[PDB]
Amino acid sequence: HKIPVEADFLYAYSTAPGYYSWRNSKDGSWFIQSLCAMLKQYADKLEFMHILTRVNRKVATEFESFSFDATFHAKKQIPCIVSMLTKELYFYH
Amino acid sequence: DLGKKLLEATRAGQDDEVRILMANGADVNAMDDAGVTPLHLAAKRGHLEIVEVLLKHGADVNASDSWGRTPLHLAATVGHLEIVEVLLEYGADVNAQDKFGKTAFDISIDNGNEDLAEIL
Amino acid sequence: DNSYKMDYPEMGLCIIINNKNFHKSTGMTSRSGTDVDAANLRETFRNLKYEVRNKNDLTREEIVELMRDVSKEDHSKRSSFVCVLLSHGEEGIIFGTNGPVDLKKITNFFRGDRCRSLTGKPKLFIIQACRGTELDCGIETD
């Protein structure tokens, strides 16, 4: 009959609430780099939530910040998947 | 990449190496991923000579890092009066706030800096 | 059924907002490498059969206006909707070149009752932006 007006949204954040989000000057942001890499590899293999979970792991384990100021050096990042989806999402139908 | 070498030379305080790199066309406004410029580094570490040569060649006096801190904020934190004077002469924003709401004047009061409170 | 219907004639739109350069008064630093992201995203989503539209350096007014116009299009023949935001940010806020935009304001345009041709369809918002100034120091692992 009725569905919520807020249903069927997905917000895929690059970083946790309250936190900074890191970009590489030459390769681009950590999140988008990982997103595109994981979609190219798994879009035909995995459901979208599991693709974004690989993205979480890739950003979490493969990236660490560089800075000449110790305030910003050796920092980490975890993305934040926010799902109000009612169904699984496959790009290959 | 000459920008990375310049940032590295500025941090180590190598004045001669800074000039050699600039003469080869290094960007005085080079940044790392956190938006830290050669001027930020020179101001924090008290390198008066390098600050002056950077500003002379058009380095952004009001560039702020990822925490919104300008070279004037960083100079005020350490308490280097001479650098503060030079920054203000190149049009440093006395009213500039970092992403934590503090001005260069606000930092000087926090530290209990007597001489810096009257200049600002 | 447990899967979204994805066999509509068209896959859907992919709107990319790519903010690189910002007004001096805002004090926000130039976002180096974001052009790489935009190009990488276009390549990826167009290979996924999405209709990609890229917009560079939009003001806060221009963002709200773009999102309103897109929400008032006919999506009845599209499977989904994708919007990627590449800019500065705070919690619940994305930045135009000249200042802040409320994130809830952008997304409200696409609510199930306001964009009828996207009801029951997945609406994907991909957000590359800060959510505050906190830094994660991390912890040692294997």
Curated annotation (Swiss-Prot), chain A:
Reported impact of R23A: Abolished ADP-riboxanation by C.violaceum CopC
Positions of post-translational (Microbial infection) ADP-riboxanated arginine modification: R23
Disulphides: none
Protein name from the UniProt record: Caspase-3 subunit p12
Protein species of origin: Homo sapiens (Human)
Gene name as annotated: CASP3
